[PDB]
Design a protein around this nucleic acid. Structure first.
Ligand SMILES: [K+]
Ligand SMILES: [K+]
Ligand SMILES: [K+]
Ligand SMILES: [K+]
Ligand SMILES: [K+]
Ligand SMILES: [K+]
Ligand SMILES: [K+]
Ligand SMILES: [K+]
Ligand SMILES: [K+]
Ligand SMILES: [Mg+2]
Ligand SMILES: [Mg+2]
Ligand SMILES: [Mg+2]
Ligand SMILES: [Mg+2]
Ligand SMILES: [Mg+2]
Ligand SMILES: [Mg+2]
Ligand SMILES: [Mg+2]
Ligand SMILES: [Mg+2]
Ligand SMILES: [Mg+2]
Ligand SMILES: [Mg+2]
Ligand SMILES: [Mg+2]
Ligand SMILES: [Mg+2]
Lengths: 151, 114, 82, 99, 127, 101
RNA sequence: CGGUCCGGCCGGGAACUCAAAGGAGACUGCCAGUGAUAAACUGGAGGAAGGUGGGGAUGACGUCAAGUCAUCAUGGCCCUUACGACCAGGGCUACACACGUGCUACAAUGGCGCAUACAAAGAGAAGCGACCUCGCGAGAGCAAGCGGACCUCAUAAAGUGCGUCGUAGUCCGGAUUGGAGUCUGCAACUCGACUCCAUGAAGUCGGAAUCGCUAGUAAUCGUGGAUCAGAAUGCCACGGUG
């Protein structure tokens, strides 16, 4: 918008865990307005992750999430006839949305059987610094260091 | 296991593996299994040979094999040299049941030509 | 498909066919009723069916029974595009 | 014994006048009037092409609103039922009598 | 006595009767879990009674019609809040602070002419 | 709309209400399931063609009253989409008015 | 409250939902700060709603010699044994191809089978058609009710629980073709819709490019209506999840 200073629509927390972060995650994962199916996928995969990675249900989700959050991105700006990838620091809230969006999109392009099994394995090896989701973060950081001259 | 369709089904559920027979679909196969008192969940394996034997004569009550291909072809060949409208459609390779030919008749006319 | 509660033939042709059977075989019986089905009484007759602008002649045989008269008289002419 | 009468009009101001008039007319005759009752109003809706030619996307939406009322008289003494037959009901309203 | 409240949502309208006692919830002559198979609907319905922690001290008798499951759950929460108002009237501010007093006035926008939906237009092509 | 067309419609209506709506028995109570599978049914079927090609209520195109326009008809008013808007707008149609909701 | 066959079904009640008439309500009205002692701006209170609360109708002088002489009207021109009128059959549905707009898919956030919840808005007399019997099914036979908050259309579907399939051109896809049927209608060959059995094309997410959408919106699921004897994937409306 040219002038509007938009507010922020509220989001209800998780029913089970009361988490304001998993409500966003369910929204990211859901499709075609089927909220219940997404909650079933996220819950089943989360508990599978908890028992695989020991204990500590939702902070097992945090430990993988903290391994994929970008800290600097690139913005394409056209100069006068050439364009540069100026690297800009990422806002706090944008860091989560980027980290969640990458995990979900990577948790779709796998050969596993279900979506719960598909997503849990991504959430696991991301905590172990493996997987396409963490590679995306590495690629973005590598791209943003090559243009550090333009910061 | 060879059945009256002398083709050979395989290790799937009974109600689906029967569908491998030309001329037997989904409901007809259910009717066949019902007349032999076989559950639709059992695979084609773990069937006693007598069970298969009583299956394969139940299929005999339908005209379902290359014999069925025979009458299908004869019905079309009849329309062919009879000369009726559907004979002309069948000989020219165009749609027969009054569909649209100005555009969009690909599955009958084949791939695109220049 | 019409019902099993009767096939359909028009009167003005049913009279002509039954009047022409006994008098033998003659010049083709000219008609416009493309929509009338073919009866076993018609076998061996020659009927000139309308196709919009001519009366194309069809010689009825045993296998063309139950078919409408029209489908032995195409109304469109098509010979290729190039 | 009870008479039940319905009122249909194309506008609410005219049906109000006729209703309040019939209702009091019976009450004069000593009977006790049950109502009036505002029944749900049936609103028809029409959409029409406004160009004589093409421009399908420019249309116009109309509607007919049919207002409806109900009153019940449950002790119709033998001076009320006839008397109702001679009321100055309006032109845009019509009445329905049921026994 | 009993205190009453009307709450409503997308297309549903709920009326809620609160009585002192122990936690009992009946919706349309059925228990809370028998009615709402959707688990977030349960969390919505209970929310006001966990904020003002009169959850085990009240009977709730509730009648709901119209709309779907999420609208009905929304109406019940609004109806509960209004009735819980009529109980105390002193615990209003904190029920206001959680956004429960506000009657959500969102409705499905009518389809418009020339558009396949409320706002989705057909495809536009230059040539 | 080419008065000849208007003449056809009025003729078809007059021809329909004379023969049929009273001679519709032979297409109903003889084309009925019963033991009349003999010539009783067959002759009725044969007789129904002898009637005029018209008088069949499935042959009236339901034109507009004021213009005879064959398309865009509205049964509630009997006029086409053009004349209804024109007459609605001057105030000839009771009750009718611009709807917004 | 009482009664009860557990059904508001009976007595009963006018509380509540609701119907539809009449009002109240929101005005930068109040508070604080900024601003040229201004207009207005930010924020706060209260309140169902806050700054045009949401949506609609409403289209200024004019522009494109824009469109319509086939709605209609109309100046000029033209035909009057025909450029007018009636009838049967055909055609507007052709098919080497190219484009526009849609629908259905390529699957596991899924297919199939069983059980089971929760809507809104509408239409109906040459009409809507219940219950019951027959049919695998479309439907057939008999026939109540309703000009309708009363009866019918009309059992919402996504959802939810259980089971099964296990990544395969498949238990995905449902195009095409054969057979057999029902219904409307004087009549379904050209050229209708739907049903059952059988068959199971392409299709494994789409090049250059390009379209819509800022919230109850996009996406997705069903429902109704007008035209109409029959004949929507279109159009116009309605609600569910979101
Ligand atoms: K097969
Ligand atoms: K002129
Ligand atoms: K034709
Ligand atoms: K065609
Ligand atoms: K296309
Ligand atoms: K389409
Ligand atoms: K046809
Ligand atoms: K298949
Ligand atoms: K119709
Ligand atoms: Mg067609
Ligand atoms: Mg919608
Ligand atoms: Mg355009
Ligand atoms: Mg017609
Ligand atoms: Mg009252
Ligand atoms: Mg021009
Ligand atoms: Mg012209
Ligand atoms: Mg056309
Ligand atoms: Mg029905
Ligand atoms: Mg695949
Ligand atoms: Mg769909
Ligand atoms: Mg529809």
């Amino acid at each position: 918008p040219r002038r509007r200073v938009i507010g922020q629509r509220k989001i209800l927390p998780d029913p089970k865990f009361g988490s304001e972060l998993l409500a966003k995650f369910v929204n990211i994962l859901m499709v075609d307005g089927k909220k219940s199916t997404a909650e079933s996928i996220v819950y089943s995969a989360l508990e599978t992750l908890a028992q695989r990675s020991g204990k500590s249900e939702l902070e097992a989700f945090e430990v993988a999430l903290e391994n994929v959050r970008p800290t600097v991105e690139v913005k394409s700006r056209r100069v006068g006839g050439s364009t540069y990838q100026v690297p800009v620091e990422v806002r706090p809230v944008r860091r989560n949305a980027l980290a969640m969006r990458w995990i979900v999109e990577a948790a779709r392009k796998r050969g596993d059987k279900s979506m719960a099994l598909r997503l849990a394995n991504e959430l696991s090896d991301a905590a172990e610094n493996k997987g396409t989701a963490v590679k995306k973060r590495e690629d973005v950081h590598r791209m943003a260091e090559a243009n550090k001259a333009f910061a | 296991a060879r059945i009256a369709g002398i083709n050979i089904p395989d290790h799937k559920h009974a109600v689906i593996a029967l569908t491998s027979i030309y001329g037997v679909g989904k409901t007809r196969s259910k009717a066949i299994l019902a007349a032999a008192g076989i559950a639709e969940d059992v695979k084609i394996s773990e069937l006693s040979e007598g069970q298969i034997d009583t299956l394969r004569d139940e299929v005999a009550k339908f005209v379902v094999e290359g014999d069925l291909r025979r009458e299908i072809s004869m019905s079309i060949k009849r329309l062919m040299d009879l000369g009726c409208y559907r004979g002309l459609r069948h000989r020219r390779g165009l749609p027969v049941r009054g569909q649209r030919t100005k555009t969009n008749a690909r599955t009958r006319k084949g791939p695109r030509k220049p | 498909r019409s019902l099993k509660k009767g096939p359909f033939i028009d009167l003005h042709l049913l009279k002509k066919v039954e009047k022409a059977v006994e008098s033998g075989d003659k010049k083709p019986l000219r008609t416009w009723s493309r929509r009338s089905t073919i009866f076993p009484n018609m076998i061996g007759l020659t009927i000139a069916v309308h196709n919009g602008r001519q009366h194309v002649p069809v010689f009825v045989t045993d296998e063309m029974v139950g078919h409408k008269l029209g489908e032995f008289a195409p109304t469109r002419t098509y010979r290729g595009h190039a | 014994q009870r008479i039940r009468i319905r009122l249909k009009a194309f506008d609410h101001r005219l049906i109000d006048q006729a209703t309040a008039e019939i209702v009091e007319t019976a009450k004069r005759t000593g009977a006790q009037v049950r109502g009036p009752i505002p029944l749900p109003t049936r609103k028809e809706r029409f959409t029409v092409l406004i160009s004589p030619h093409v421009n399908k996307d420019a249309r116009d939406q109309y509607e007919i609103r049919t207002h409806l009322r109900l009153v019940d008289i449950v002790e119709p003494t033998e001076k009320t039922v006839d008397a109702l037959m001679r009321l100055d009901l309006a032109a845009g309203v019509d009445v329905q009598i049921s026994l | 006595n009993q205190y009453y409240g009307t709450g409503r949502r997308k297309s549903s309208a709920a009326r809620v009767f609160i009585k002192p006692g122990n936690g009992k919830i009946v919706i349309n002559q059925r228990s809370l879990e028998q009615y709402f198979g959707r688990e977030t609907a349960r969390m919505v319905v209970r929310q006001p009674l966990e904020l003002v922690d009169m959850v085990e001290k009240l009977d709730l008798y509730i009648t709901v019609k119209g709309g779907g499951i999420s609208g009905q759950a929304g109406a019940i929460r609004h109806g509960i809040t209004r009735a819980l108002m009529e109980y105390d009237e002193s615990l209003r501010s904190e029920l206001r602070k959680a956004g429960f007093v506000t009657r959500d006035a969102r409705q499905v926008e009518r389809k418009k002419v020339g558009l396949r939906k409320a706002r989705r237009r057909p495809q536009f092509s230059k040539r | 709309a080419k008065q000849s067309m208007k003449a056809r419609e009025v003729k078809r209506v007059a021809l329909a209400d004379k023969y049929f709506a009273k001679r519709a028995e032979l297409k109903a109570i003889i084309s009925d399931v019963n033991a009349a599978s003999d010539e009783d049914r067959w002759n009725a079927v044969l007789k129904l063609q002898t009637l005029p090609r018209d008088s069949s209520p499935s042959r009236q195109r339901n034109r507009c009253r004021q213009t005879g326009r064959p398309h865009g008809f509205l049964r509630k008013f009997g006029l086409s989409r053009i004349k209804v808007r024109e007459a609605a707008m001057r105030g000839e149609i009771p009750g009718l008015k611009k709807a917004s909701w």
